[PDB]
Every structure is written in structure tokens, then in C-alpha cells.
Amino acid sequence: GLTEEQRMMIRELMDAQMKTFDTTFSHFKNFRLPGVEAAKWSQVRKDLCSLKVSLQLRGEDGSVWNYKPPADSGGKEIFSLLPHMADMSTYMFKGIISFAKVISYFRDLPIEDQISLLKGAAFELCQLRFNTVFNAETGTWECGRLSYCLEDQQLLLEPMLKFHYMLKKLQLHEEEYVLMQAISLFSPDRPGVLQHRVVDQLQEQFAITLKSYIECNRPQPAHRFLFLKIMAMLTELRSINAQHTQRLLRIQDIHPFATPLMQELFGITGSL
Ligand SMILES: Clc1ccccc1C(c1ccccc1)(c1ccccc1)n1ccnc1
């Protein structure tokens, strides 16, 4: 029950996803690994505690490395995973940027608005892509030969983590994830967007396509209100990206770690 525009639209997004989402992370390599005042630090210590995972690395030859992070002993060991996480984020961001740049609706926008939309939505799209490799039975993001496991059920208090569990519960299709990415990418209200009305119209068409996709392919009474649930999750995603953004900026304030691409997306000038 989708129109021809809508069917073309979903195809173009699925195409962009297929070309730019390295789902086995095969080309994530050369990354760093952990080695072998006052009220800021209290806040940053709390910040880093929420971002805590163990790391497993499965060698192509069959070997396995496992890293268990330290406890907070009041020092600098709380920063040990930041260079690795910066490299993973950077790698995800490159995929996100490539995703946007092959979408016709995005390429047609002026360059400054392209940049403003990517700066506004990079994290959100990264989180949506991470959700598709999140294993909610083991609390593990399965990134090909890398796995990141939550240290350990009072962790669902963390809004990022509650989001991943709730979104995974909806059992979305690939098409529904990529429409979510599009709706978040084409948010007309990001800082610096000039063409508000053009982006808003595009956003509305992505949401209408999603509504129609669901109505036509999900008749089960379990998926009643699925569209509205998804849209409320998108609002939650925006809110937690703002929280997560401020958290990384606090951490970055006292222990620098953003790569140049992360700095670009943050608007960090390299000046002081
Ligand atoms: Cl992606 C990211 C960047 C910086 C810090 C933490 C995370 C995190 C993650 C995701 C996949 C693989 C390793 C870490 C992360 C890990 C644990 C707790 C919070 C965030 N992530 C961002 C959003 N959802 C998950």
C-alpha cells in the first residue's frame, strides 16, 4: 500500500545503508587499545562510569584477547578506554557521513546545511546503527570480531542503555531502522540549518513513508501504535544525544580524546 515515491525512497535508503554500513566491522582496524576543578572530576568520574564496557577481540587466527577495565581508584585509569572508543566512534561517524552523502534528498541540500544536519545527527545515527548489532540477551554490542559487553539490572537506569533495550524490543525491520536514521538526519531544527522548510518537508515525507510501511506490513495487534512508539523513541534519542554530547564535552574538558573528525562534529576549533 506504499506509493511509488515511497517505495523508491525506501529503496534508496536501504541502498545507502547497504553500501555504507560495514556490519562486520571488517575495515575497522589500526585502532588504539588500553595500555599494557574538583567538582568537575566528581562529575567526570560519574560520566565515565556510565560508559564502561569490557572488550573482546577475536583474532582471525582463532585467538581471543579480553580486556576488563579497572575500577575507579580515584586516578587516571578511568580514561583507559577513551582512545579506543574515539577510534570506534570515528569509524562509525565516517560510515554515517557516507550514508548521508549518497542519499539524493541529502545531496540536493546546500553544503552548509548538509554539514549542519550531520553535526546535529551523527551521534543519533551512530546509536541507531549500534542498536542493530546490540544483543539484549547478553548486553553486548557484537561488532564483527570485536565485542563490547556491559560490566554488570540497575543499568537500565542509564538512559543510553534503557534506549538500546527498549528499541531492540520493538523488533524493527531493516527498513524501519533506516527510516529512523532518515527522520533523525532530516531534523529541521538543528543548530545552523538555513533551509528549515525544505528539511521539514523532507522529514515529514520520511515519517509518512514509515507510517505507511508499518500499516502495510505490520497488521499484528502487537504492532498497534508501532509508528507512534518509534516516533517517541526518536524524541528520546534526540534527548539522550544532547546528554551524551555534554558528557563527552565534560570528559574532553579535563582529559582530551576527541579525534579531529569528532572535533569537527563538535565544532571544536583547535584553538583555545
Ligand atoms: Cl559508541 C560509544 C562512544 C563513547 C562511549 C561509549 C559508547 C557506547 C559503545 C557502543 C558500542 C560499543 C562500545 C561502546 C557505550 C558503551 C557503554 C555504555 C554507554 C555507551 N555506546 C554509545 C551509545 N550506546 C553505546
Please report which helix (H) or strand (E) contains residue 23, including its range: none
Instruction: Confirm whether residue 127 is marked as ligand binding.
Output: yes
Quick one: cell of 213? Answer: 510501511
Q: Strand 64-67 and strand 53-58: pairing?
A: antiparallel
Closest by CA to 167, choosing from 220, 124, 216, is 124
CA distance 237 to 121: 10
Burial of 128 (0-12, 13-18, 19+ CB in 10 A): buried
Going 175 to 180 to 181 to 182, the CA torsion angle's sign is: positive
For the chain, what is the domain count? 1
Cβ atoms 197, 122 nearer than 8 A: no
Contacts of 167 (CB under 8 A, 6+ apart): 128, 131, 233
Is any ligand 1 atom within 6 A of the Cβ of residue 198? no
Instruction: Confirm whether residue 227 is marked as ligand binding.
Output: no
Considering only CA atoms, give the Rg of the chain: 19
* Span from the CA of 68 to the centroid of ligand 1 (angstroms): 15
Is any ligand 1 atom within 6 A of the Cβ of residue 127? yes
Letter for the amino acid at 120?
G
The experimental method behind these coordinates is X-ray
Strands across the sheet containing 140-143: 64-67, 53-58, 146-150, 140-143, 134-135
How many other β-carbons are positioned within 10 Å of the β-carbon of residue 207? 19
Cβ atoms 180, 128 nearer than 8 A: yes
Instruction: Using DSSP, state whether 192 is helix, strand or coil.
Output: coil
CA distance 14 to 62: 33
Question: Position of cell 540536493?
Answer: 108
CA distance 252 to 254: 6
* Span from the CA of 149 to the centroid of ligand 1 (angstroms): 10
Burial of 205 (0-12, 13-18, 19+ CB in 10 A): middle
Instruction: Find the domain containing 33 and state its range.
Output: 1-272
- Name the closest-CA residue to atom 20, ligand 1: 51
